[PDB]
Write an enzyme that holds these catalytic residues in place. Structure first.
Site, short mmCIF file in Angstrom:
data_model
loop_
_atom_site.label_atom_id
_atom_site.label_comp_id
_atom_site.label_asym_id
_atom_site.label_seq_id
_atom_site.Cartn_x
_atom_site.Cartn_y
_atom_site.Cartn_z
CG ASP A 19 -9.82 11.35 8.86
OD1 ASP A 19 -9.31 10.58 8.31
OD2 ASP A 19 -11.29 11.73 7.91
N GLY A 21 0.87 -0.82 -0.17
CA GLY A 21 0.01 -0.05 -0.16
C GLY A 21 0.74 1.67 0.35
CE1 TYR A 61 -14.06 -1.97 1.58
CE2 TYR A 61 -12.38 -3.79 0.46
CZ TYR A 61 -13.53 -2.68 0.27
OH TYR A 61 -14.44 -2.14 -0.87
CG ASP A 113 -6.06 -14.76 3.55
OD1 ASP A 113 -6.23 -14.07 4.13
OD2 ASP A 113 -6.46 -15.86 3.43
CB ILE A 114 -4.20 -10.20 7.78
CG1 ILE A 114 -5.89 -9.25 7.12
CG2 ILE A 114 -2.74 -9.80 7.10
CD1 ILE A 114 -5.34 -7.72 7.28
CE1 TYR A 125 -10.91 2.58 6.36
CE2 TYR A 125 -11.24 5.25 6.72
CZ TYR A 125 -10.50 3.56 6.30
OH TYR A 125 -9.43 4.24 6.63
CE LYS A 128 -8.15 0.92 9.96
NZ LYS A 128 -6.93 1.48 9.50
#
Length: 286
Positions: free
Chosen positions: A105, A12, A63, A38-39, A130, A134
């Site tokens: 954020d 990334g 993601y 593969d996490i 998302y 997170k």
């Protein structure tokens, strides 16, 4: 003496920046992304942790397709941000490793008044899928790993992935006027600054916990302001519009500006976002 480092999400934007920074510092690491670990697969996560036995883990895998996370990418958003974080946190816990987790954020509701800033102890209340996953990731890290750093960042750009800077540059190649939202506030973050910060925390054994890291700003800043600066040397006029002009699926935070006080109090020097852009343009990209 030297830490044995594992980087997840190595391909990334941040993971790539970080690998190249550690290369410059002649620091060894093992870098993994989907192909090598593969996490989502716990057995695999535990197997690789037993192979590498890391003392320090930079967990950059995430993601981040915000609109997709609401629907078509929902299963993968949850699997990567929740399950993947759970597996890495548990394997870190078992191996006694220090874990650095990069967050967002988007854990906040964006309602902070303009001119005010999110502090590390403000209560998350995500309004997007998302942000929800997170925040679940953050809680998993804090639950499982005593020796942790969670760094919330925002508006991330750099030379090692797609981002708003490249998007605006590309649009300006064939348009003499462009519109950009002017009612969503925040601050850009250059991946090089972020990579320097997270390594600064870990290498100097700064206090475990939550931190906020973006580049700094002397004014309240919107995407429009960011675009104006990106395109200042380009033959284009950027025009401001409100959020209703381009209706997105996911609710975008009105104000994601984060307090940089805790990061600054560690002694880390944070460039302004305008200065970071200049450093970005100069970087001898690998």
């Amino acid at each position: 003496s030297n830490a044995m480092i594992l980087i997840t999400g190595a391909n990334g934007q941040l993971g790539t920046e970080l690998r190249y920074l550690l290369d410059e510092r002649n620091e060894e690491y093992v870098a993994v992304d989907v192909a090598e670990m593969d996490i989502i697969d716990a057995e695999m996560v535990e197997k690789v942790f037993e192979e590498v036995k890391p003392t320090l883990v930079y967990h950059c895998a995430a993601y981040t397709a915000v609109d997709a996370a609401e629907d078509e990418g929902k299963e993968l958003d949850f699997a990567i941000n929740v399950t993947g974080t759970k597996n890495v946190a548990k394997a870190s816990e078992k191996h006694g490793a220090t874990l650095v987790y990069i967050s967002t954020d988007y854990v906040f509701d964006g309602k902070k008044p303009v001119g005010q800033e999110w502090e590390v102890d403000d209560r998350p209340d995500p309004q997007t899928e998302y942000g929800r996953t997170k925040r679940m990731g953050e809680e998993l890290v804090e639950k499982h790993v005593s020796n942790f750093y969670i760094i919330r960042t925002a508006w991330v750009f750099g030379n090692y992935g797609k981002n708003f800077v490249f998007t605006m540059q590309n649009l300006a190649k064939t348009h003499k006027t462009l519109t950009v939202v002017n009612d969503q506030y925040g601050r850009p973050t250059w991946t090089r600054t972020l990579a320097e910060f997270i390594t600064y925390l870990a290498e100097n054994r700064k206090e475990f916990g939550y931190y906020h890291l973006s580049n700094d700003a002397t004014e309240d800043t919107t995407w429009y302001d960011f675009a104006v600066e990106i395109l200042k040397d380009t033959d284009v006029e950027v025009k401001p519009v409100d959020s209703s002009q381009f209706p997105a699926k996911a609710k975008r935070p009105l104000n994601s500006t984060m307090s940089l006080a805790k990061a600054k109090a560690t002694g880390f020097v944070i460039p302004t976002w305008q200065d970071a852009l200049q450093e970005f343009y100069k970087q001898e990209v690998r």
